[PDB]
Coordinates of all heavy atoms in Angstrom, one line a residue:
Chain A
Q266 N -2.7 -24.6 -16.9 CA -2.7 -25.8 -17.8 C -4.1 -26.1 -18.4 O -4.3 -26.4 -19.5 CB -2.2 -27.0 -17.0 CG -0.8 -26.9 -16.7 CD -0.3 -28.0 -15.8 OE1 -1.0 -28.4 -14.9 NE2 0.9 -28.3 -16.1
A267 N -5.1 -26.1 -17.5 CA -6.5 -26.4 -18.0 C -7.0 -25.4 -19.0 O -7.6 -25.8 -20.0 CB -7.4 -26.5 -16.8
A268 N -6.7 -24.1 -18.9 CA -7.2 -23.1 -19.8 C -6.4 -23.1 -21.1 O -6.9 -22.7 -22.1 CB -7.1 -21.7 -19.2
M269 N -5.1 -23.5 -21.0 CA -4.3 -23.7 -22.2 C -4.9 -24.9 -23.0 O -5.1 -24.7 -24.3 CB -2.8 -23.9 -21.8 CG -2.0 -24.4 -22.9 SD -0.4 -25.0 -22.4 CE -0.8 -26.4 -21.4
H270 N -5.1 -26.0 -22.4 CA -5.6 -27.2 -23.0 C -7.0 -27.1 -23.7 O -7.2 -27.6 -24.8 CB -5.6 -28.4 -22.0 CG -6.4 -29.6 -22.5 ND1 -5.9 -30.5 -23.4 CD2 -7.7 -30.1 -22.1 CE1 -6.8 -31.5 -23.6 NE2 -7.9 -31.2 -22.8
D271 N -7.9 -26.3 -23.1 CA -9.2 -26.1 -23.7 C -9.3 -24.9 -24.6 O -10.3 -24.7 -25.2 CB -10.4 -26.1 -22.7 CG -10.5 -24.8 -21.9 OD1 -9.7 -23.8 -22.1 OD2 -11.4 -24.7 -21.0
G272 N -8.2 -24.2 -24.8 CA -8.3 -23.0 -25.7 C -8.6 -21.7 -25.2 O -8.3 -20.7 -25.7
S273 N -9.3 -21.7 -24.0 CA -9.9 -20.5 -23.5 C -9.0 -19.4 -23.0 O -9.3 -18.2 -23.0 CB -11.0 -20.8 -22.4 OG -10.4 -21.6 -21.3
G274 N -7.8 -19.9 -22.5 CA -6.7 -18.9 -22.1 C -6.9 -18.1 -20.8 O -7.9 -18.2 -20.1
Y275 N -5.9 -17.3 -20.6 CA -5.7 -16.4 -19.4 C -4.8 -15.3 -19.8 O -4.0 -15.4 -20.7 CB -5.3 -17.1 -18.2 CG -3.9 -17.8 -18.3 CD1 -2.8 -17.0 -18.1 CD2 -3.8 -19.1 -18.7 CE1 -1.5 -17.6 -18.2 CE2 -2.6 -19.6 -18.9 CZ -1.4 -18.9 -18.6 OH -0.2 -19.6 -18.9
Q276 N -4.9 -14.2 -19.0 CA -4.0 -13.1 -19.2 C -3.5 -12.8 -17.8 O -4.2 -13.0 -16.8 CB -4.8 -11.9 -19.6 CG -5.4 -12.1 -21.0 CD -6.4 -11.0 -21.2 OE1 -6.0 -9.8 -21.1 NE2 -7.6 -11.4 -21.5
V277 N -2.3 -12.1 -17.8 CA -1.8 -11.8 -16.5 C -1.5 -10.3 -16.4 O -0.9 -9.7 -17.3 CB -0.4 -12.5 -16.3 CG1 0.2 -12.0 -15.1 CG2 -0.4 -14.0 -16.5
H278 N -1.9 -9.6 -15.3 CA -1.8 -8.2 -15.1 C -1.2 -8.0 -13.7 O -1.7 -8.5 -12.8 CB -3.2 -7.6 -15.2 CG -3.2 -6.1 -15.0 ND1 -4.1 -5.5 -14.3 CD2 -2.3 -5.2 -15.5 CE1 -3.9 -4.2 -14.3 NE2 -2.8 -3.9 -15.1
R279 N -0.1 -7.3 -13.7 CA 0.5 -7.1 -12.3 C 1.3 -5.8 -12.1 O 1.4 -5.1 -13.1 CB 1.5 -8.2 -12.1 CG 2.8 -8.1 -12.8 CD 3.3 -9.3 -13.6 NE 3.3 -10.6 -12.9 CZ 4.4 -11.4 -12.8 NH1 5.6 -11.1 -13.2 NH2 4.2 -12.6 -12.2
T280 N 1.2 -5.4 -10.9 CA 1.9 -4.2 -10.4 C 2.9 -4.6 -9.4 O 2.7 -5.6 -8.5 CB 0.9 -3.3 -9.8 OG1 0.3 -3.9 -8.7 CG2 -0.2 -3.0 -10.7
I281 N 4.1 -4.0 -9.4 CA 5.1 -4.2 -8.4 C 5.5 -2.8 -7.9 O 5.9 -1.9 -8.7 CB 6.3 -4.9 -8.9 CG1 5.9 -6.1 -9.6 CG2 7.4 -5.1 -7.8 CD1 7.1 -6.9 -10.2
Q282 N 5.5 -2.7 -6.5 CA 5.9 -1.5 -5.9 C 7.3 -1.7 -5.2 O 7.4 -2.6 -4.5 CB 5.0 -1.0 -4.8 CG 3.8 -0.2 -5.4 CD 4.1 0.9 -6.4 OE1 5.0 1.7 -6.2 NE2 3.4 0.8 -7.5
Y283 N 8.3 -0.8 -5.5 CA 9.6 -0.9 -4.9 C 9.9 -0.1 -3.7 O 9.3 0.9 -3.5 CB 10.7 -0.7 -6.0 CG 10.6 -1.8 -7.1 CD1 9.7 -1.6 -8.1 CD2 11.3 -3.0 -6.9 CE1 9.6 -2.6 -9.1 CE2 11.2 -4.0 -7.8 CZ 10.3 -3.8 -8.9 OH 10.2 -4.8 -9.8
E284 N 10.8 -0.5 -2.8 CA 11.0 0.1 -1.5 C 11.5 1.5 -1.7 O 11.3 2.3 -0.8 CB 12.0 -0.6 -0.6 CG 13.3 -0.7 -1.2 CD 14.3 -1.3 -0.2 OE1 14.4 -2.5 -0.1 OE2 15.0 -0.6 0.5
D285 N 12.1 1.8 -2.8 CA 12.5 3.2 -3.1 C 11.6 4.0 -4.0 O 12.0 5.1 -4.4 CB 14.0 3.3 -3.7 CG 14.2 2.5 -4.9 OD1 13.2 1.9 -5.4 OD2 15.3 2.5 -5.5
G286 N 10.4 3.5 -4.1 CA 9.3 4.4 -4.7 C 9.1 4.1 -6.1 O 8.1 4.5 -6.7
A287 N 9.9 3.2 -6.7 CA 9.7 2.8 -8.1 C 8.5 2.0 -8.3 O 8.0 1.4 -7.4 CB 11.0 2.2 -8.7
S288 N 7.9 2.0 -9.5 CA 6.7 1.2 -9.9 C 6.9 0.5 -11.2 O 7.4 1.1 -12.2 CB 5.5 2.2 -10.1 OG 5.2 2.8 -9.0
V289 N 6.5 -0.8 -11.3 CA 6.4 -1.5 -12.6 C 5.0 -2.0 -12.8 O 4.4 -2.5 -11.8 CB 7.4 -2.7 -12.5 CG1 7.2 -3.7 -13.6 CG2 8.9 -2.2 -12.6
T290 N 4.5 -1.9 -14.0 CA 3.3 -2.6 -14.4 C 3.6 -3.5 -15.5 O 4.5 -3.2 -16.3 CB 2.2 -1.5 -14.7 OG1 2.6 -0.8 -15.9 CG2 2.0 -0.5 -13.5
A291 N 2.8 -4.6 -15.6 CA 3.0 -5.6 -16.6 C 1.8 -6.3 -17.0 O 1.0 -6.6 -16.2 CB 4.2 -6.5 -16.3
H292 N 1.8 -6.8 -18.2 CA 0.8 -7.5 -18.8 C 1.3 -8.6 -19.7 O 2.1 -8.3 -20.7 CB -0.1 -6.6 -19.6 CG -1.4 -7.2 -20.1 ND1 -2.4 -7.5 -19.2 CD2 -1.9 -7.4 -21.3 CE1 -3.5 -7.9 -19.8 NE2 -3.2 -7.9 -21.1

Side-chain angles (χ1 to χ4, degrees):
Chain A
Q266 291 175 322
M269 169 195 62
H270 167 79
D271 76 4
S273 57
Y275 60 86
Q276 299 170 49
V277 174
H278 181 220
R279 76 230 310 237
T280 63
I281 308 181
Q282 281 311 312
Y283 295 89
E284 58 177 86
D285 59 358
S288 300
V289 166
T290 65
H292 193 66

